[PDB]
């Protein structure tokens, strides 16, 4: 009856940004009050809708994308942005309708000595299309000489671990991100507010 936002926002494990997770939300009641009655979210912005009116809205389907990046990169989770994350990992369309939510997760995703399980794609031949997901692990040929399955100069592996230490600067600390996409189809609305 009520939409399972707890499985998304309160999940104990989050995906790497290059392999970002998507959950479809449908046929339920959406109560976004948890976004208001909380001084814990660091980013809560919407595009195409008013963020204070979410409980008054209905949609055919809602899609929740979640992943971890570092604080300095949260600004790239927006339409028209540029950078490693927006270009190679997770890109929003220009006509994006939905909301972007983020919060500091240093207490969950950083470890003494460092947590390196979260990865991001560092090299790619071209930018992603909006909502495209690339999980390939081909050696990146930076130069003109083929690599022949061997790494070295101008032959790199495309993924790179984040280095999340508890004592990192807040810009280098891990942040958990949730992107809500609102979809309208020629069909009855199955995700409404209270």
């Amino acid at each position, epitope marked *: 009856n009520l939409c399972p936002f707890g499985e998304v926002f309160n999940a104990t494990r989050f995906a790497s940004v290059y392999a970002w997770n998507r959950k479809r939300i449908s046929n339920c009641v959406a109560d976004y009050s948890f976004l208001y009655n909380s001084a814990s979210f660091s980013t809560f912005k919407c595009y195409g809708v008013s963020p204070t009116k979410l409980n008054d809205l209905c949609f055919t389907n809602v899609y929740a994308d979640s992943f971890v990046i570092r604080g300095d990169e949260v600004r790239q989770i927006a339409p028209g942005q540029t950078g490693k994350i927006a270009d190679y990992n997770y890109k929003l369309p220009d006509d994006f309708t939905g909301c972007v939510i983020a919060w500091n997760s240093n207490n969950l995703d950083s470890k003494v000595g460092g947590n390196y399980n979260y990865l991001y794609r560092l090299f790619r031949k071209s930018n992603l299309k909006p909502f495209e997901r690339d999980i390939s692990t081909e050696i990146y040929q930076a130069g003109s000489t083929p690599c022949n399955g*061997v790494e070295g100069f101008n032959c790199y592996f495309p993924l*790179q*671990s984040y280095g999340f230490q508890p004592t990192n600067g807040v810009g280098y600390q891990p942040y958990r991100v949730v992107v809500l996409s609102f979809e309208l189809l020629h069909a009855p609305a199955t995700v409404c507010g209270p």
Partner: nanobody, 127 residues
Framework: EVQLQASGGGLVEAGGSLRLSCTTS????????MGWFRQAPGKEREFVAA????????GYADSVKGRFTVSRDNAKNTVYLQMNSLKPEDTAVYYC????????????????????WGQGTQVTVSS
């Protein structure tokens, strides 16, 4: 308390061969990318070879490709560098190096991607 201990090396003639080994203590070796660098007297430290722990790829400097072979035995916490067809320009101090536990490093040739360094082993190839 993380320690890298190397064995092998020494003096050979041109065309000879060697085998270096490097054993770690205090690390989960099976989740650590291992590497070999070298430094000639007066010159800068340069990349030689590397072997990944998760994605299996090997890495080699262009000058040693085809002559050197890097390998690893996780059960013995050991990484190996077989150096065949040695040239005089291979003379240097060779350093074993290790990245961090679970870390996925993209660029194998960058020394800053390795956190633990061995003491170094002399390799001389004359005439």
């Amino acid at each position: 308390e993380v320690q890298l201990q190397a064995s092998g090396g020494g003096l050979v003639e041109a065309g000879g061969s060697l085998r270096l080994s490097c054993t770690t203590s205090g690390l989960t070796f099976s989740s650590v990318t291992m590497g070999w660098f070298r430094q000639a007297p007066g010159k800068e430290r340069e990349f030689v070879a590397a072997i990944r722990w998760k994605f299996g790829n090997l890495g080699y400097a262009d000058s040693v490709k085809g002559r050197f072979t890097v390998s690893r035995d996780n059960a013995k916490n050991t990484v190996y560098l077989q150096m065949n067809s040695l040239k005089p320009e291979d003379t240097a101090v060779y350093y074993c190096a290790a990245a961090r536990v679970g870390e996925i490093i993209a660029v194998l040739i960058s020394p800053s991607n390795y956190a633990y360094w061995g003491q170094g082993t002399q390799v001389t190839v004359s005439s």
